Amino acid sequence: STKELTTARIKDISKPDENNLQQQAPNRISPWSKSQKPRAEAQDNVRFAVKDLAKQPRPYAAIDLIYKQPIRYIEHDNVAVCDGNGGAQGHPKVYINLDQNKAIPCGYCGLRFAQAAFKEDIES
Amino acid sequence: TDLAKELVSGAPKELITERVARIYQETETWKIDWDILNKGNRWENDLMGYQSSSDYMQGTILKFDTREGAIRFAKGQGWDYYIQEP
Amino acid sequence: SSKFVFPKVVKELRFFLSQTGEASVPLRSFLTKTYPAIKKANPTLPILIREAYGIPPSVTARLEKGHEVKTNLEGFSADQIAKTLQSIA
Amino acid sequence: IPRYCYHEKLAVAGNCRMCLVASCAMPVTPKIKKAREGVTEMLLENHPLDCPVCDQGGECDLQEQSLRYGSDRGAVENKAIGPLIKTSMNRCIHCTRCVRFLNDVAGANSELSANVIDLCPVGALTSKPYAFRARPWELKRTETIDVHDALGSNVRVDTRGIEVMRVLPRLNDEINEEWISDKTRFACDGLKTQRLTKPLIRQGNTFVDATWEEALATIAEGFQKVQPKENEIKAIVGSLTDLESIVALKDLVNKLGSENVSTDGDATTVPPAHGADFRSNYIFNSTIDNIEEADQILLVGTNPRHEAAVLNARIRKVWLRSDLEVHHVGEEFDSTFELNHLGSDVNALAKALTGEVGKKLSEASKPLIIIGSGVTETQDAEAVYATVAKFVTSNANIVTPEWNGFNLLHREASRVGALDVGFTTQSPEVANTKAKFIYLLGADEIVNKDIPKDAFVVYQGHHGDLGASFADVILPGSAYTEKTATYVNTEGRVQSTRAATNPPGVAREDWMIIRALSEYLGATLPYDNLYEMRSRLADVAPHLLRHEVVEPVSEGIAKVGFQSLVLLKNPIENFYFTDVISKSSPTMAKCV
Amino acid sequence: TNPTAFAQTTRYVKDSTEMRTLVLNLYRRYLRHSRGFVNNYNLDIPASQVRTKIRQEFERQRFVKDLPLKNVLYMKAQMEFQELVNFWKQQCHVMQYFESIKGDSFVQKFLKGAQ
Numbered sequence A: 001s002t003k004e005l006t007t008a009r010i011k012d013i014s015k016p017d018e019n020n021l022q023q024q025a026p027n028r029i030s031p032w033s034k035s036q037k038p039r040a041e042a043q044d045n046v047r048f049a050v051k052d053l054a055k056q057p058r059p060y061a062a063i064d065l066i067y068k069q070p071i072r073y074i075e076h077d078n079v080a081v082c083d084g085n086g087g088a089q090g091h092p093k094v095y096i097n098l099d100q101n102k103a104i105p106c107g108y109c110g111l112r113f114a115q116a117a118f119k120e121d122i123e124s
Numbered sequence B: 001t002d003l004a005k006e007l008v009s010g011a012p013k014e015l016i017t018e019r020v021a022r023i024y025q026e027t028e029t030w031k032i033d034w035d036i037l038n039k040g041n042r043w044e045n046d047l048m049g050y051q052s053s054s055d056y057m058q059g060t061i062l063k064f065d066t067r068e069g070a071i072r073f074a075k076g077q078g079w080d081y082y083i084q085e086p
Numbered sequence C: 001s002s003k004f005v006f007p008k009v010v011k012e013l014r015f016f017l018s019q020t021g022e023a024s025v026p027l028r029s030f031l032t033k034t035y036p037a038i039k040k041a042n043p044t045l046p047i048l049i050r051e052a053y054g055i056p057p058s059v060t061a062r063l064e065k066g067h068e069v070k071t072n073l074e075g076f077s078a079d080q081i082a083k084t085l086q087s088i089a
Numbered sequence D: 001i002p003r004y005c006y007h008e009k010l011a012v013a014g015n016c017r018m019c020l021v022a023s024c025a026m027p028v029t030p031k032i033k034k035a036r037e038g039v040t041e042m043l044l045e046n047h048p049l050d051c052p053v054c055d056q057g058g059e060c061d062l063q064e065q066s067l068r069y070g071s072d073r074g075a076v077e078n079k080a081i082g083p084l085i086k087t088s089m090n091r092c093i094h095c096t097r098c099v100r101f102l103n104d105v106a107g108a109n110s111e112l113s114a115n116v117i118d119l120c121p122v123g124a125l126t127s128k129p130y131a132f133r134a135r136p137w138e139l140k141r142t143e144t145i146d147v148h149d150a151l152g153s154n155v156r157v158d159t160r161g162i163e164v165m166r167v168l169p170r171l172n173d174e175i176n177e178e179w180i181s182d183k184t185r186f187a188c189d190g191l192k193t194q195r196l197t198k199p200l201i202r203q204g205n206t207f208v209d210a211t212w213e214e215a216l217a218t219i220a221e222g223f224q225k226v227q228p229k230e231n232e233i234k235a236i237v238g239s240l241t242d243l244e245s246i247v248a249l250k251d252l253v254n255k256l257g258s259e260n261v262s263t264d265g266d267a268t269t270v271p272p273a274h275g276a277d278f279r280s281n282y283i284f285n286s287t288i289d290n291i292e293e294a295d296q297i298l299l300v301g302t303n304p305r306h307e308a309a310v311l312n313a314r315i316r317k318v319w320l321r322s323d324l325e326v327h328h329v330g331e332e333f334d335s336t337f338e339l340n341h342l343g344s345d346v347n348a349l350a351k352a353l354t355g356e357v358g359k360k361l362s363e364a365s366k367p368l369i370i371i372g373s374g375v376t377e378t379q380d381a382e383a384v385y386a387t388v389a390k391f392v393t394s395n396a397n398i399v400t401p402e403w404n405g406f407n408l409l410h411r412e413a414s415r416v417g418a419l420d421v422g423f424t425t426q427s428p429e430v431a432n433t434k435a436k437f438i439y440l441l442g443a444d445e446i447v448n449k450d451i452p453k454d455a456f457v458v459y460q461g462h463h464g465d466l467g468a469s470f471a472d473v474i475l476p477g478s479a480y481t482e483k484t485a486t487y488v489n490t491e492g493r494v495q496s497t498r499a500a501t502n503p504p505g506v507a508r509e510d511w512m513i514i515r516a517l518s519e520y521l522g523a524t525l526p527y528d529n530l531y532e533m534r535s536r537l538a539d540v541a542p543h544l545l546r547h548e549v550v551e552p553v554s555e556g557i558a559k560v561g562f563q564s565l566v567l568l569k570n571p572i573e574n575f576y577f578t579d580v581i582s583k584s585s586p587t588m589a590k591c592v
Numbered sequence E: 001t002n003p004t005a006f007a008q009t010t011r012y013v014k015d016s017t018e019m020r021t022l023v024l025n026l027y028r029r030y031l032r033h034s035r036g037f038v039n040n041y042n043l044d045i046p047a048s049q050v051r052t053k054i055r056q057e058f059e060r061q062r063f064v065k066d067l068p069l070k071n072v073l074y075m076k077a078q079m080e081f082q083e084l085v086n087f088w089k090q091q092c093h094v095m096q097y098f099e100s101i102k103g104d105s106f107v108q109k110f111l112k113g114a115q
Ligand code: SF4
Pocket: D047, D048, D049, D050, D051, D054, D055, D056, D057, D058, D060, D061, D062, D063, D091, D121, D122, D123, D124
């Protein structure tokens, strides 16, 4: 189709086949940033003429992995505290306001926090 | 004052014949930089996307404490320069 | 009126003078007092007057095919300035 | 002397307490050092640890004054105010600089509302298109001018290599005064889309890539085919066209025995109602700085909200510090300052000159009259430009040795520069002639100008738009950020853009294109470099080689120019779409 | 210590007549050692061409007026001579020295992007 391989989208429209070497990542088909060069166009070069594409470095896309984590829910509070879940080996500690009726991701980790009283609306 | 110190400096002739310098007060010192090349100032490297260049004066920025020093030095090197009035 | 009906080969005139001094006054007096007569005789001819501090007076005559002949009028008399315009043709 | 809440362009505040000796509000040592440390810790008590992910990182006033005047040891939800300002109020230090600008200068959703990003000293308010893309130490700073409006506001262009990152205002107390419009700063992303990078040759209903040697040869085979006679060679100049290219195109058509040169405007009267014969007839003779000392200003067929937003803020500033009264004639509009509306035509303007407005203007120490750029495109331009001129000449205060009270306000930068080099035909005999060879020097306002079906049309420009579609051969040009060009604003000041980046693809400098085309068409111009090109500029107007200098018109000569002159719709239908660079902007589409 | 072979002590000459004689003496030394340059550096040109190249470099600075520039030019010309005779320069540098050398029109440069 060449459209899911060369365009940046929020979510993939089809199932990622990890044996397809034209995908941007083994778990994601389309690029996850507007300036990111599509992997299909990158490998269409003179330097890839006689190389094995399967052995080239293909890390999994972080955008697909971070959103499979469940939304954290806070009980009896309006502020979520995150410090990378590692302390001195995590990220700087930040406080996340939960006033709105939505899941607000962490500025470093990407973990999406929410209030438990807003659980049903967000799951919808 | 009027000595052609460019004859014994060792710099190539293009600084005198082709390149043009700018004298400006950017907010307490006077600086001298060179106008970019029309072509060859930058071009994307096809391998890793690095910013290539053939301008060897691109990163050179002289500093002066007075406006008189900047003009006197530029004349002493025979440089083609224009003063950007503050 | 007079000889101020410029020929068709004459396409543009530009007058240069200064806001101050004493050399531009003869051209300043010439153009200020005579402009309506020239524009009346040459309704479509573009008469351009441009000033700059300290430049000497002159007239530029843009003839056919982009040809330009510039006459310097540094300190000339108003009567001779009128003669000079008559001699542009 | 550290500060967070002090800025002389705004009102005085004492809610930051960093200027203790509050010296900002107060008119005219270890305790002070201890005091500065104590105040600094209070701001950092609640501040979030966001510096790595915060756009103010290398240019943060809170960081620098924590380092300089503090010790080294020690949750508010966000809001939405538009797609242009990214708000993270956790970082706000509660300094009220946003409130003073949004209510006193802006008058607000505004054309100046994006300037609050500059005033916010911390990362509470940051540019949204610029978010996460660059650090201030990566950027090369280039001092140039704006061409999105006729003001010529002095902007600072920050480039990271080839790319242009952001546009920031730079100080100039004569034109813009530290402010730029949202168009002036958020249209830079149009320079990366729809760009003309390759010569394109039209073969049927398609365009194909071409070399410069061919694209300048197809024109020659196109110029020798249609064979335009004397006044059948039509050359058109658009809004964003530099002066070095207007003069080159003017001389090229002349060497082909032609004078049919014009702009992209739709002025019905072929000689513009102001006339290009005298400079004083079409410039801001009072100069932008002297708008401060205004007593009575007459706005004639102009909308400063859209025609020139930065200058519009100057009017509001005087309206607050004094008792200025501004009388406006024409179509009504929402205004940031009080206006006494008179009428929507020229009958009211003449009647206003016979009413209380004329009496105030007669006895005003420094009167002002402002005529819009769209007035010349309206039918009653002859009526206005004679009604006002007769009023100007009949009275004394309007034209004095110390004060000149007539000003024409344009909207497109290339206008005044074209007029000074005499790039406007002064005859309807030349203008009405049919065209066979058409050269669109960056002109895209052709929805109203005739284009014959058999005419050979060449588009030279830096963007692909409607004007490029009509072309038979497309020549790529360089945008203003890429060329060392010359622009003259509405007040007659010569300002030169400084080249920050190279043009993209195989695009060339705009005037070098015309000179090269001359050698192919037997009209070889004598120009060989920019210095020789700029020497020619002094041969068309002596003042053009005087950068940043206004050459005031002599009082005596300007009087004759005023004398010889003897529905006002707003010209702009959409603010976000004025020039080609704004149309390609994705950010401006979000504003729409 | 002792100076290397063909070394001259640096002196600031204050007399244009005395400077002129020193330049002419050095010019003769370049001509005399021209056959040596062809031998040591294995050049592909006759010594006659080498002497012609020497004269061109001396003719470039023929009309230098300022005395302070003459001394620096003379001092640098002596250093180069001591470099060539003692075979300190590598043969590649001397070969490229003789590798040195119609300008295109406006359109020709315009087509290729100019300079
Ligand atoms: S506003 Fe300044 S101190 Fe606060 S997070 Fe941003 S860079 Fe750090």
